[PDB]
Amino acid sequence: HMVRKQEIIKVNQQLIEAISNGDFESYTKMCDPGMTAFEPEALGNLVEGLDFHRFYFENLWSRNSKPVHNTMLNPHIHLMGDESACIAYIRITQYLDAGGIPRTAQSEETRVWHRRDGKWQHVHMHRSGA
Amino acid sequence: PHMVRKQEIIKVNQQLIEAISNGDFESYTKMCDPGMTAFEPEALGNLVEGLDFHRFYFENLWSRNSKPVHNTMLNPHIHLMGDESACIAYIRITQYLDAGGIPRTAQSEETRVWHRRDGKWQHVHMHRSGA
Amino acid sequence: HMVRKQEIIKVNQQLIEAISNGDFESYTKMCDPGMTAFEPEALGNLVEGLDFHRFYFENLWSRNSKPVHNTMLNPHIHLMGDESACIAYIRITQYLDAGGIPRTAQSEETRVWHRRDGKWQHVHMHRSGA
Amino acid sequence: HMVRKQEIIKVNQQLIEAISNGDFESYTKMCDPGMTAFEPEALGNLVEGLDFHRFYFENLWSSKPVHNTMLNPHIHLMGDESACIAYIRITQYLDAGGIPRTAQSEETRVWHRRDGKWQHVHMHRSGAPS
Amino acid sequence: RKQEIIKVNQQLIEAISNGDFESYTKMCDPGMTAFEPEALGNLVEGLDFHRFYFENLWSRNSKPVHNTMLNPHIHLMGDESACIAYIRITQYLDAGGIPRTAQSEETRVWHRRDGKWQHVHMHRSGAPSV
Amino acid sequence: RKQEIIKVNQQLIEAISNGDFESYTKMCDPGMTAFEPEALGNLVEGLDFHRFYFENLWSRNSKPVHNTMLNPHIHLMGDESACIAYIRITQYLDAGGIPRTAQSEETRVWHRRDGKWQHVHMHRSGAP
Amino acid sequence: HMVRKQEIIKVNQQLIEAISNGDFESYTKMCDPGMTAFEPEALGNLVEGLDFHRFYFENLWPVHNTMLNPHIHLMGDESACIAYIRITQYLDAGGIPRTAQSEETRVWHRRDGKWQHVHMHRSGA
Amino acid sequence: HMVRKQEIIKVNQQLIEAISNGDFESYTKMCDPGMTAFEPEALGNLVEGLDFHRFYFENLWPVHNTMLNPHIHLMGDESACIAYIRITQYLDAGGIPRTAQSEETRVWHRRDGKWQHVHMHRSGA
Amino acid sequence: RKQEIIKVNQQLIEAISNGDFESYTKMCDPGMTAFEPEALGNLVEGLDFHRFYFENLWSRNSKPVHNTMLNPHIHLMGDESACIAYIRITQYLDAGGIPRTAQSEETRVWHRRDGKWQHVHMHRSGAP
Amino acid sequence: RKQEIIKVNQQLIEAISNGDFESYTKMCDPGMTAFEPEALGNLVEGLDFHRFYFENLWSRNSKPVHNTMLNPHIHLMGDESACIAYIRITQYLDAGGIPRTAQSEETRVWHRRDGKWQHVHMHRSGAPSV
Amino acid sequence: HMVRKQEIIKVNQQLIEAISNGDFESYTKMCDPGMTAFEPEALGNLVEGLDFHRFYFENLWSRNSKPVHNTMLNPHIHLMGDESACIAYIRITQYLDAGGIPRTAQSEETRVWHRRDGKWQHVHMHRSGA
Amino acid sequence: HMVRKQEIIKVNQQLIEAISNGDFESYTKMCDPGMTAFEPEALGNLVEGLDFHRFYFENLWSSKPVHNTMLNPHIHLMGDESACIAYIRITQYLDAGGIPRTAQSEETRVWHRRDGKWQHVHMHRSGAPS
Amino acid sequence: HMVRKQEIIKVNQQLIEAISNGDFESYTKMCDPGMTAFEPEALGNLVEGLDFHRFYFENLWSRNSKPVHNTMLNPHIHLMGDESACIAYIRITQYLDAGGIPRTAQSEETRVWHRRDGKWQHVHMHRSGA
Amino acid sequence: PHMVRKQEIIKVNQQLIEAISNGDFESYTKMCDPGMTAFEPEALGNLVEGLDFHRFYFENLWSRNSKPVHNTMLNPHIHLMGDESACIAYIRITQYLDAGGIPRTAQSEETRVWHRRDGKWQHVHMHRSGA
Ligand SMILES: [K+]
Ligand SMILES: [K+]
Ligand SMILES: [K+]
Ligand SMILES: [K+]
Ligand SMILES: [K+]
Ligand SMILES: [K+]
Ligand SMILES: [K+]
Ligand SMILES: [K+]
Ligand SMILES: [K+]
Ligand SMILES: [K+]
């Protein structure tokens, strides 16, 4: 069990890493093309596909001049058979504002994973917090 | 068989939402895994584990007829992950009567994750944002 | 055209009359069962069917019979064949507040009508404003 | 009818891209000369004709990348020559400071088949002005 | 001439004050238009809009009000039409019985049909229904 | 019949935004009156009060501006008098290039003299 | 000219009194029928005072008025102008004493032996 | 009495002009040395106008003044009272045209053949 | 010498809060003047303006009230005139029983006539 | 008598306006007291408090100010002391050169020592150092 | 190790239980009399002894008519030898407000324990959050 | 001196309990008749004597349980007959609604040994008024 | 007494003079090394030694030599033997803001002095106000 | 021996506070247990574990001379728990120069827990409230 929960923890860390670096290629590689997302930026609408996030990679997140640290705190992993997983955690984002003063942001994240063709694929996420 | 499964998920999710609406904590526990986790605005950004946190709301806020309420599930999107795993995401509109008796409306976004154990669907994780 | 446009004005006036009265039975008759609606009380979501609207008739507009007057201001009508119409207008709703002071509320309304089996049926509405 | 619903989808997509690209010539091509419009920039008034929108094409839309996405389109078909499409629209843009923002609007657009071509006869938009 | 326009205009205002809707309808063309603050910046046609204010306030209150027509200016265009413009001062009592005053600017257009002057358009700017 | 009043009224509105005081005087009876927000609730008589705004604004600030009369209602009173009432939508650019829109309600009274329509009174409420 | 100035204060004092108690017939006797008035209740317009004030006498009217620093301009045998700060002490329906200040200009004309009020200008309250 | 009323408007018009351009010597010629004034700049006090206004002529003073609805009370051969709304169109240092309204009462006295300003009362701006 | 001015000034202050208009008149020259906030910036002359406040307040609202002159400064000018300036602290109960404290600054000018000090002018700033 | 108190009081105010601290000290008793808004509700003794305002503002600015003494009231108590009370109006220019006006109420007490009047106490209420 | 961390978890649960019930006796029994506390109610001062908390037991917390649930989330326990422990956790308080509407509060708590005479004693606490 | 510092502690504690109990007789007993006081209720003024404080004893302190605690007292000894004690004071009380509140003040109290008895000669309190 | 009280006034005036000048060297000489202080910039805490005060001399009152005047208003002095004194007064600090406008600040000050080896030493201060 | 121990705790806590003041992350790690936990306002009410969260602040905000600062430890209270465990609680006043160069002041309350491992004190938990 625990080895499989650490498997989900690893790929989710890699997923958050592509967000911090702005690596949309690795982000796409880990996401199922038909994934859905509930996100504050989407104004309460469910968004399907990776278009809504590509616009954030191409602009705000590719400004990689700034440094960012994303901490996953106390991830709770639900295993549902050998093929499905759901991980839930508090996400702490450390970044620099305009002027270079360090600041932190909190968001709660639920991410659902399904293993398709022997590879973990991210099929649905839900984030709350600005 | 996936089309029939999606309708099984919608119905059991509908029944979970009405058990909450009527404060039916006996049916709520019937449908929930004992180790289910929850992100909801009432938990102030914390993940709560088990049905302990919700029991306080069933015992002190939800009666089977405390006030009229209408909970609409808008365009649910269902991910089926193999044979016995499902994720359903939907916008939920709540029509309620406020303190002054005025009909109002509230929107929340809900993800609910279900796992089928020994032939029955069990709720294992929910994430609610909004109202 | 002028006789056909006056037919759409008349059934639309009856629909708005049913709303002010609270007569949900006539409102239902004039609306196709699968009508859709954009209106502020839906918080930006498209609602289907008369289901969402029962709660506002049954728990309000029936209330305590205080006077409510509704006016269609200079309606614009688009005729699309002999079986379809779109009508758009400023709606002025006169009402009495808690206190008895006469007040006015403005909304912009788009209402789409379909001629189904002899009878005009309300198929889609879009309201913005108060 | 399934072919018709997809025709309404494509012609509505083409109208949205013409507004996003500031292409007033294509917008005029797809629009009936006597079309009406409820939209926030008109301050709660029904405007008729393309003259009101030409000011926004020439002096604005003709600047920065904009991502206009159509969410969950609902299409009512009234006969073979009339249609009404309603959807939520999410606009992704860069503000004055270049930071990506998102804005939601609800849109109703009514189309009329004229001489073998769909013609935009009425629109209703609620949400934030551009 | 001009004293006849001042006369009938005084009767109309006095009919408004008394809640005398019968004399008001007798003086007003049934197709008159009105620009008024209560209309929220819209042009209202007909007599039913004001009838709501008559039947639920002005005919409801015989409480003392005094209306002053200050230096009316009258344009006579031919023999059968006139336009009178004036400052209107309304003295009245508020909720606590305090005497209050309110200023509005009024334009009123009169058309003599069959020997009797008929009110066909009014424009009021200022405080609403005070 | 009503299309002539619409045409003459649009020309008066164009001459206002083009700072064209000459065309404005040609269409206005010299004894015209006006209720408008800039007059602070007073009735102003003649063409002198508007000249100050023609010289120091509508001319001086000439920029892309579009004025629309929305669904005008015309009262015809004989064959020599007319009252046109309409919502007036002003599309302009603010300092900074951002397109803006302003609404006002306008009543304008016209009188026909020697085959020419003359503007005798206006009333404007809303945006100043 | 302290003698004729003292008469203007006297007749102006009776005007305030007839106002201060709600007596309209004394007011109407002392006021020319074509009297004009600028005052805060007129919202910046010149008004015929008698038609405008009868509403305040039929409805609005422990009050103490006080005329501070009366300055009188004498103008022949027929007219005079008196300007002064007017202080008003009153009970505000809550029992509390309040004080209000207004500046008043009052013009008087003696047409047929009697002084009649011709024009007033009040500001401040 | 439209003839003698037209003269009061004329001399009052020259006063506004002498004020509107910053000419103090014309103002001083037309003003009685004991002229009094209520005006917003006096903060509710009656002031000798000539001593008070010279500061506004030495410092404060594209402007268009307009006298609306002048009402003139004639009072014998020596005095008259003129009341009117005064509209002022000006440039607010930002280039934008603004409009200000004031209500003015002006009392005039003809002592030695010439009309001299005796008392003014302005409110509103 | 200065203790006599302090004593007479305290008595005037006590008579003010006790609604004792009779003792107030005995200590005040009938031609006294007063600058105080209730007079809205005007100088009031005599004893009539204060009587309205004696009848409708300081009497009517008689309740526990303590008035303290804080470190009075006395200017002696001959043997017949005195000016005393001090912070005046008013301890009272509001509606509801809550003890409150108000401050004002007071100048009071006294003139000795026939062996008796007479109050000729006061100036108060601060709490109304 | 009283015109002598008005005279010396005018000189003092004119010394304040000119920043003329030498003439100010000559007119003021070195043990004078003052109640002033700038003192924040405290009684100040001596001349050094005002010297700060002289040395860092009034002697710093020859910018135009005009002071008006309105209807001074004077109490004469014997032969060697006087109290003058008056409204003071101060005309001046602000930062943008706008002419401004300010009212304060002033009481000033004068003691004639050795034939020369000496300022021993002042009380000012109103606007601070305007 | 883990059995000893569950030992600290147990007595800390019992400590929070006395707070929820208002049981000052059991609270005193578990606390060292010389314990210190950093608490928001103490306004940023360190408080020693159990006096500051007794006043809260005797009033707000002994109003046991209301129900309260106190959840200790993800306790992290530091063991420092066999005699000392430090537990840190997020504390969630569920309660009823005036009117009976359920509400939740969050506080972060650090609590230090020392085993004296074979019994765990609470020697120092630090709480943040209202 | 160690005995002296504990004498100052006890007599200061007795003064605080006399204020808390509203015992004006004991307060007068421990206070010098010419004592001075800076405290917020005096609005930033130095008051002399016990007369100012008698108003607060008679009309207030003479109601509800109050917990006045002395935090970290610092005592300066100046000879054998003079002392100055400074401390933070935390007041625990029930407001109008009975809910327990806490208030902080900083207190300096100066004591003088007179005729073999310590006498309170000066106090300075900053913080919130009672 | 009067000569002894004037000695305390003089050394206290020198201390306040050193503050306005920023002369930290004389300020140190007049202060006992272990003096304590209550002042607003300490956020309610009692600070010991001149340590806390170096940061405010060295980084401010030295600054750019703009004028600063300080006045002791009617000081009250308590003499406690021949070796101890407490002085209390309103302090008025005149200063120039950024912009050159003369402004005033008020504070209440208690300063306790100890005669140690011939020289007066400042042993405790308490300041409230600005 | 407890009096000497308390002064050891004060000194090592003083050194930890100056390593933070000068951004000395090499000394900070020397004094901290690798599994130390922290409650601080920057963590938004969350317990952070390890020195990872603080490393971002050393690397981007704390230099050895970025600005003058004075950190006063007010009246520390030290609990000694046996031979090799200590808890120190104190109010901390920070004197800093703000953006405009104005000298300001900030108060925080700090608990720091130390464990003596193989002869050296190691910081294992901190809780900061306030500024
Ligand atoms: K179950
Ligand atoms: K077309
Ligand atoms: K009629
Ligand atoms: K013309
Ligand atoms: K005009
Ligand atoms: K007397
Ligand atoms: K008086
Ligand atoms: K001198
Ligand atoms: K005693
Ligand atoms: K280490």
Swiss-Prot record, chains B, N:
Post-translational modification: Palmitoylated. Probably palmitoylated by ZDHHC3 and ZDHHC7.
Record PTM Phosphoserine, positions in chain: S63
Highest taxon of source: Eukaryota
Location relative to the cell: Synapse; Postsynaptic density; Cell projection, Dendritic spine; Cell projection, Dendrite
Assembly and oligomerization: There are 4 genes encoding calcium/calmodulin-dependent protein kinase type II chains: CAMK2A, CAMK2B, CAMK2G and CAMK2D. The corresponding proteins assemble into homo- or heteromultimeric holoenzymes composed of 12 subunits with two hexameric rings stacked one on top of the other. Interacts with BAALC. Interacts with MPDZ. Interacts with SYN1. Interacts with CAMK2N2. Interacts with SYNGAP1. Interacts with SYNPO2. Interacts with SHANK3. Interacts with GRIN2B. Interacts with CACNB2. Interacts with LRRC7. Interacts with GRM5.
Known function: Calcium/calmodulin-dependent protein kinase that functions autonomously after Ca(2+)/calmodulin-binding and autophosphorylation, and is involved in various processes, such as synaptic plasticity, neurotransmitter release and long-term potentiation. Member of the NMDAR signaling complex in excitatory synapses, it regulates NMDAR-dependent potentiation of the AMPAR and therefore excitatory synaptic transmission. Regulates dendritic spine development. Also regulates the migration of developing neurons. Phosphorylates the transcription factor FOXO3 to activate its transcriptional activity.
Family assignment from sequence similarity: Belongs to the protein kinase superfamily. CAMK Ser/Thr protein kinase family. CaMK subfamily.
Record's disease association: Intellectual developmental disorder, autosomal dominant 53: A disorder characterized by significantly below average general intellectual functioning associated with impairments in adaptive behavior and manifested during the developmental period. Intellectual developmental disorder, autosomal recessive 63: A disorder characterized by significantly below average general intellectual functioning associated with impairments in adaptive behavior and manifested during the developmental period. MRT63 patients manifest global developmental delay, severe intellectual disability, and seizures.
Protein name as annotated: Calcium/calmodulin-dependent protein kinase type II subunit alpha
Included range, full protein: 345 to 472 of 478
